[PDB]
């Protein structure tokens, strides 16, 4: 009756009447290799007895290219393997991760294990509802599903992308307000394995570009409103297959910040460029996955570096798209490897290493802390790494090119970090935030305000600054990524309310100076917890109020108000021992507000502020006024350009 025994035949035979040869197809082969419900679904989806005129119309609706342009191909090398030595390890079932030597990840792991780690969730694409029905046959794809679902107000193209080890699919569902759809599909991958088309289309006609390995397919109907059809797919394939991995990531990054340049990282009328950018992202992920898949033993260091690059790409893309979603990826074995590798780095060892082995460990931390589980030992390591690079920086007060990348890595490590348990670790992190806000000077702020105004040649991976980790709040065509990167720590600064009792609105707060057992709030407005200090020199239109609240939620120990500027020449270039330490120094001007802040931790610092190459002691104006602060809630003004 039903399907269970309808196949009493031994096999199915395909026959050609004009040729005296018989073709065969053993029935059990289809039943085992592909599932029975998939087989019946495939037969039903074919529309076997559909009228020829309907298939003709479906043929005319599509748009076809000129020819399958073939190029020398094979691209570049995205692959990295072990450097011809014995550091390779085969994780059998649960091989103990404490047996992995070293603290730099120079060893190698199984490539197939990490492959299954990236692709671990099955999917059933080309469902009965989606317009993938008419184009593609239904298929089961285990992949990392993306999503850029952008709206629902009769706008909102659903760009549900897919990244598999063999192919990349991306779609441009125009849900609109009716049943009809404009399903602009883009495919990229091995031409041999691809989602089979219906009877009204073929790859031999639709393959826009070809390589020795990779083919790009553009299955997009013509009658629909697609201005995107006026572009050279050959140029896209050249830009996507011939550049080095670093150049490809750079081009994706610059395209994304260009989308930021206009309102396209939030709007709808620029849907096709977002669609193409998402496609480029998916094929970059596919290229990385294929490069890892090519070998069988892969180096953890290079893998983690590539993962950090892809992570940063996903972060910036989510920074445009709040709705950006990425599901189905489970970096479990790599996470355990990184955890047990970085559980053997003491806080001193991390600071002692050179700035080429401080990036690898922190990339492992990034990989292992997607959930906010960074160990406190690594938090102290970050603390004294920032201390070391601060002491290096305090000599000439210029910033290089390895330290900014390292600082970006620690920024994204701390951003996706949950609050720790020990209060001392939180205090140390708060100290390092103070060190970063002392790092962000007027010149550095000028570099950022002038630098991000030109996204055409911008590259975030090198355009970083300590202001993207500092406690300064005065962030005030052009890219709007300043606050977009500031919020990644501002909303997740361990215990976000550094202020505890006098809860005041954070609208006109310029600075927070969190010294040990005292907190300073610099704002043009004022709090109501205790007395404040106000500058008498207010002849211009500005307000500068500073309050000193205790972390123990208590008022001032002394009620004396200044309301004046004490002028004295005291405390010149200090003596030996430790006269000034664990303190901060302000710098403000009557024409710009707050200029800079400085934190001192060791003798080298206060010996080093008084250099001619320091940002301070410059002749911009006749009148600059410094401030003296220490960790007991008193303000004494310093006058004198010595």
């Amino acid at each position, epitope marked *: 009756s039903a399907t269970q025994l309808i196949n009493g035949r031994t096999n199915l035979s395909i026959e050609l009447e004009f040729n005296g040869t018989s073709f065969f197809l053993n029935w059990q082969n289809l039943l085992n290799v592909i599932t029975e419900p998939a087989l019946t679904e495939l037969w039903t989806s074919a529309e076997v007895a559909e009228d020829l005129r309907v298939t003709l119309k479906k043929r005319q609706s599509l748009f076809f290219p000129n020819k399958t342009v073939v190029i020398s191909g094979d691209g570049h090398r995205y692959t990295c393997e072990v450097p011809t030595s014995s550091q390779t390890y085969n994780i059998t079932k649960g091989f103990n991760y404490s047996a992995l030597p070293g603290h730099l990840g120079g060893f190698g792991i199984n490539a197939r294990l990490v492959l299954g780690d990236i692709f671990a969730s099955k999917w059933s694409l080309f469902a009965r509802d989606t317009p993938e029905y008419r184009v593609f046959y239904p298929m089961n794809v285990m992949a990392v599903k993306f999503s850029i679902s952008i709206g629902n107000n009769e706008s909102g193209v659903a760009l549900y992308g897919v990244v598999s080890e063999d192919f990349v699919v991306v779609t441009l569902h125009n849900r609109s307000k009716e049943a009809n759809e404009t399903a602009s599909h883009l495919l990229f991958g091995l031409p041999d394995s691809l989602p089979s088309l219906k009877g009204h289309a073929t790859y031999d006609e639709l393959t826009f570009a070809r390589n020795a390995k990779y083919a790009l397919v553009a299955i997009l109907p013509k009658d629909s409103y697609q201005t995107l059809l006026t572009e050279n797919y050959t140029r896209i394939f050249l830009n996507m297959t011939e550049s080095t991995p670093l150049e490809f990531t750079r081009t994706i990054q610059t395209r994304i910040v260009s989308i930021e340049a206009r309102r396209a990282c939030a709007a709808q009328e620029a849907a096709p460029d977002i669609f193409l950018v998402l496609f480029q992202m998916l094929v970059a992920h596919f290229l990385v996955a294929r490069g890892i898949a090519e070998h069988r033993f892969v180096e953890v260091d290079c893998v983690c570096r590539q993962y950090a690059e892809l992570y940063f790409l996903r972060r910036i893309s989510r920074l445009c798209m709040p709705t950006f979603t990425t599901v189905g990826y489970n970096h479990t074995t790599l996470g355990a490897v990184a955890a047990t590798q970085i559980a053997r780095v*003491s*806080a*001193t*060892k991390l*600071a*002692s290493l050179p700035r080429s082995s401080q990036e690898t460990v922190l990339a492992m931390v990034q990989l292992g802390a997607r959930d906010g589980a960074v160990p406190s*030992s690594i938090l*102290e390591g970050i*603390a*004294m790494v920032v*201390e*070391h690079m601060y*002491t290096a920086y305090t000599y000439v007060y210029t910033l290089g090119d390895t330290e900014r990348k390292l600082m970006l890595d620690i920024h994204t490590v701390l951003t996706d970090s949950c609050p720790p348990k020990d209060s*001392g670790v939180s205090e*140390k992190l708060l100290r390092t935030y103070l060190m970063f806000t002392s790092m962000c000077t007027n010149i550095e702020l000028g570099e950022m305000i002038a630098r991000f105004s030109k996204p055409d040649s911008l590259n975030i991976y090198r355009a970083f600054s300590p202001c993207f980790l500092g406690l300064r709040y005065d962030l005030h065509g052009t890219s709007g990524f300043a606050e977009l990167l500031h919020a990644l720590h501002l909303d997740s600064l361990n215990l976000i309310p550094a202020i505890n009792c006098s809860k005041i609105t954070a609208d006109k707060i310029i600075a927070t100076v969190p010294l040990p057992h005292v907190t300073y709030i610099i704002s043009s407005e004022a709090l109501s917890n205790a007395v404040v200090y106000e500058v008498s020199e207010i002849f211009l239109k500005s307000a500068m109020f500073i309050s000193a609240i205790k972390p123990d939620c208590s008022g001032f120990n002394f009620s004396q108000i200044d309301r004046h500027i004490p002028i004295v020449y005291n405390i010149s270039t200090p003596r030996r021992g430790c006269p000034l330490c664990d303190s901060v120094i302000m710098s403000y001007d009557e024409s710009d507000g707050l200029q800079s802040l400085m934190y001192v*931790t*060791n*003798e*080298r610092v206060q010996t080093n502020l008084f250099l001619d190459k320091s940002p301070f002691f410059d002749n911009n104006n006749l009148h600059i006024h410094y401030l003296w602060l220490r960790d007991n809630g008193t303000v004494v003004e310093i006058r004198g350009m010595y």
Partner: antibody
Amino acid sequence: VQLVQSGPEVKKPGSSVKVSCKASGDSFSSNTISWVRQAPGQGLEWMGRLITILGTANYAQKFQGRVTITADETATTAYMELSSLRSEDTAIYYCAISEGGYTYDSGSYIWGQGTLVTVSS
Amino acid sequence: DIQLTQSPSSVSASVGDRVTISCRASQGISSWLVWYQQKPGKAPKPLIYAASSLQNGVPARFSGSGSGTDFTLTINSLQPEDFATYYCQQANSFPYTFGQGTKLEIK
């Protein structure tokens, strides 16, 4: 096992000493230096420690203003200087390396042979 | 500030036996405790760091345990080289401190 330090000294009370500790193996910038003194017949007493990456040092309360631990530029020698050596300060002074956190030494600990500082008149 | 004690202050363990040295603190020091073994005159030879992890070269005949405020050094087997005045040093806070020294000798 063990490190290399200076020789034994006998010195007039009121003077200063410069007992030093040698790096036996890798460079000293990776670890932190703790100086521990032990009077004869007594248990050891911690004096001070120094995180040489920053150069910051912190010592106990009794030895405040007397013991000063500093690191050489090359990060291969530790110079402990004890000012105004006052009467009872004879001890087999020891230097101990320790690689660890910001305020706690967890990982490593190996000790030098220790110089025998004596007061004789 | 931080203060520790050791007990018992004397053990007449002969050889090849089990000896326990308790090191009781007065606050919490996590698990950062270092056991030493210092013969007279010579430098101390640290044995266990993190109160449970053996130092390099140290024989497995030493095994420590405990955390928070109670720690312990259960030496499984004894040799005359092991015989010395031990010290438990907290490695958690400032003004670090040692124990008064378990005076362990032969019977």
